[PDB]
Design a protein around this nucleic acid. Structure first.
Lengths: 67, 119, 82, 51
RNA sequence: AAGUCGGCUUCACCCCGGGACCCGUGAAAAGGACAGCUAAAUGUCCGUACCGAGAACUGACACAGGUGCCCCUAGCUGAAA
RNA sequence: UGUUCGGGUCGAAGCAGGGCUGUGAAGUCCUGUGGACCGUUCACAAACGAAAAUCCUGGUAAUAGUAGCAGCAAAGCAGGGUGAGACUCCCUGCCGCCGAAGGGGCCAGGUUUCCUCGGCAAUGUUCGUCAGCCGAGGGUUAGUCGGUCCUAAGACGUACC
RNA sequence: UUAUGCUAUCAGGUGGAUGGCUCGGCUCAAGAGCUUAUGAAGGACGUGCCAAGCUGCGAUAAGCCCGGGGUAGGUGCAUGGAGCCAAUGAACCCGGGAUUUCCGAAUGGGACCUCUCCGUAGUGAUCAUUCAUGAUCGGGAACGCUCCGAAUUGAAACAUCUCAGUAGGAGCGGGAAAAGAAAUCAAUUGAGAUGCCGUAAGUAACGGCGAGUGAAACCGGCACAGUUCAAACCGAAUCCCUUCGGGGACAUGUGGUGUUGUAGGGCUGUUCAAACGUCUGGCGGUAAAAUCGAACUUGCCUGGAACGGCAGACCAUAGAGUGUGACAGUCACUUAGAUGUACGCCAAAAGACCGGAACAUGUCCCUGAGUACCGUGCGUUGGAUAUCGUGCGUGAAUCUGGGGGGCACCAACCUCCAAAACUAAAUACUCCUUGAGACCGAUAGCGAAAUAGUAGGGUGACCGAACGCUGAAAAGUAC
């Protein structure tokens, strides 16, 4: 299934959510860098699912008043 | 679903063509067998990927098979054994309309299936 | 809001690794100060200078010259470039 | 070497990257039904009404 | 590879000064100088490719027109571009 | 359209040609083609009948393989390559053009035409392996160069009227 | 082999007519009807693994979160590859949230430009008697109200007139708006707010009395609704904000009473007792996605495929229709008929509250001013010496009063009470939703069956196309 669910995000802590957000940003940076070379990604859906997981995490953070 | 509010062909066909996905789910309905209709209380149910159906119209009448695939946008199902041999010679599956088949065995791996079929 | 989108990997951009410079596609809204601070936060390396241009794809490219030797290689390895 | 501002250059870049053919995979997906494109142009013709 | 020297001239460029004309008497403001020396930090944003035209502009055109021009242009002849 | 009675995948409409009937408007049938709709009684309606409007829209002739591809400006030739294909693309030599502009720099304007690779259906007034063409990828780095700052003729905003 | 040609047919090419089909258009009916500084509409730019247009979205970017319905697939127009998501219930739909770049009412300043400068982090402008705070700005298909205001044209010319208060302009503004409870209409004595429809009626009236223009009342309907101030009498007896301490307004008057014509009210006295209305309350209706909904997929024939023919079996409060390989009440969605539904909306029983209605008496008090009226000028009007408006001038009265009754004045009679204010319904319209149709059927019907106000054209105001269809299934032609 997906990288991490809404229940998982609400179960983690504030620092845990920030750490996961940083890791997801790192993976997105790495994948966009690979795509910068023109070559097809090894996981085409990976980028979009990372972005949607980042959006979900940010939404949970905004609900929880972290940002 | 399209009520007798509009009896116009344009509106009926527009409703079918622009039906949402939750309405196209209901477009996959097929007649249940005599035993299934008796033991469910409804006359029809939506064909699902996996259950066994008998094709009763077309070039493949009488064949029983499991639903390999379902396309809601196309309104089609793919059944084991219902194939077209192409110019390569390889066998591609031929999509069928669910109203041309009859469910003989239901897939019940999903606990929500009973209320899905009725109620 | 991170200004850095991703490391830019072309032939000319890879030619920067041998002079310790690293090229990034960044947010066109951001400026050199924001790019420097965000890169320093992102990788923990002190940035010596930032050069920036705008392209005909509507992107902004920034070449970063670092102060620590081998910082560009280490960031490229961390990202997965090298 | 006319001098554009940031937004003018951004709009020129948008026009340039619009000036592209439809993808072959898009043609395959549409079954040769979307092959054309209204924003195709040539640089040496009626200029852009953008800048 | 030599890579060292002299001489002549010098526009259409730079500095400086003189004179004549009035008939348009020929801009303003920022900035700078007159009291600053030393050492660290900072100096953001936008443009920057290429054509600039007898094929990259404009005239529907790869149009004998037009489009800022250069305070751009080597030797001989010749007053001379 | 209402209404009566029908025809059609054992082949409707339409289309090409033909037979018969009717003074005729037209109707019917046959052959082929076509692949799903079409008629008929009594009545009722109309966005109801085209050969013409220097008619409109679309398509397409004769003209016709004709004019043009000739002032620019002396414009090419030899040899060797590349390539399936070469007057036309590349190299060398010779012979030529401009040389106070046809060279160099750059404003406005253009907006990727710049560079590399791969192509030649269209473009190029011929051809083309070439290309400002087509497809793919890349390319523009500033405290010192400009804008940015200042004000000019003169605009614009607010207030008053 | 007579070429170059001519005529007819046939085969093929080009082309896209005809026929058939159509998720589009158009018109009519019924609903529903505002939105934005809590930053709208609109635009720019970005946003997809391969993504250029459109569409959606906004750096959380064809999307994120929560609740309900739905349940096994999904990843828009748009079945291509490779992945991703989904039984931790996705997609989808209903409701509620979050994010929401820059410009834009655009609002810290400037904008050539959709960015940029200061960053002192931004209440831009005009306003509201507590300076806490609050209001206005832009948009909306038409409709509504106020004001400004042509000409073509007709008169077979043309000037008054007509065209026409049209076209167009400016301001305001809501789901409606305006009007609205007689200083009215009548006529002998009556009616009784306003609006809208029918009629009056091409009548009265105007008019080179030409062409033309052109009412109203009465009456019949839809829908019905009445009231509040100023003043008289009283005199702070009040209203607002609040940090609940207090502050503000207010004697140049907050509040009580009072609101009108055969006059009414106040003041003085007597009697009857209190209707309408405001609030609480939520019986019960209305009410999201949505749920259920009868009865054949039986034999033979034809066919690639039955929904067809011929036999057979059924349902019908369901024989409207659409899909499904050819014509389907019984295959599917439906249909007739029942169910359910969060937030909401209306809403009856039953309670809380200010209070209402008659008469008697009268050297008593009050009842709207540059107003009503009039002179003159102009526009407009059917308004004619008798429409309405407003420029200038002039200019009253106060219940023993004032106005009207189509020239003025006199008299009689009838009728009302202006010059302050509000007020549902009946009515208009169609961005939008639903339905319907002797409507069109791809040169038609919207310009647009749409990657359409697009391609394209014009410096600009603005002008503006063309393009639908394989097949039952890609089985989209192996070698």
């Amino acid at each position: 299934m997906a990288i991490l669910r809404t229940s998982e995000i609400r179960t983690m802590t504030i620092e845990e959510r920030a750490d996961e957000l940083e890791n997801l940003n790192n993976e997105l940076v790495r994948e966009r860098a690979l795509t910068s070379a023109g070559g097809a990604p090894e996981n085409p859906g990976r980028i979009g699912e990372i972005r949607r997981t980042i959006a979900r995490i940010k939404t949970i953070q905004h609900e929880l008043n972290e940002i | 679903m399209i009520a007798m509010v509009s009896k116009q062909p344009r509106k009926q066909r527009k409703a079918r063509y622009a039906a949402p996905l939750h309405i196209r789910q209901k477009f996959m309905g097929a007649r249940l067998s005599e035993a299934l209709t008796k033991e469910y209380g409804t006359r029809s149910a939506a064909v699902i990927t996996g259950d066994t159906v008998k094709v009763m119209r077309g070039d493949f009448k009488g064949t029983e098979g499991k639903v390999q695939s379902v396309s809601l946008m196309d309104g089609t199902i793919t059944v084991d054994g219902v194939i077209s041999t192409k110019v390569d010679g390889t066998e591609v599956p031929r999509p069928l309309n669910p109203s041309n088949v009859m469910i003989t065995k239901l897939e019940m791996k999903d606990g929500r299936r009973a209320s899905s079929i009725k109620k | 809001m991170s200004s850095i989108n991703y490391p830019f990997v072309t032939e000319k951009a890879m030619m920067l690794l041998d002079e310790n410079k690293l090229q990034f596609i960044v947010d066109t809204r951001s400026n050199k100060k924001q790019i420097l601070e965000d890169v320093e936060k992102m990788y923990g390396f002190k940035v010596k200078s930032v050069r920036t241009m705008t392209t005909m794809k509507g992107m902004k490219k920034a070449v970063l010259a670092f102060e620590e030797p081998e910082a560009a290689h280490e960031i490229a390895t961390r990202i997965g470039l090298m | 070497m006319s001098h554009n501002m940031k937004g003018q250059k951004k709009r020129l870049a948008k026009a340039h990257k619009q000036n592209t053919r439809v993808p072959v995979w898009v043609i395959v997906k549409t079954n040769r039904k979307v092959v054309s494109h209204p924003r195709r142009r040539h640089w040496r013709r009626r200029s852009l009404d953008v800048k």
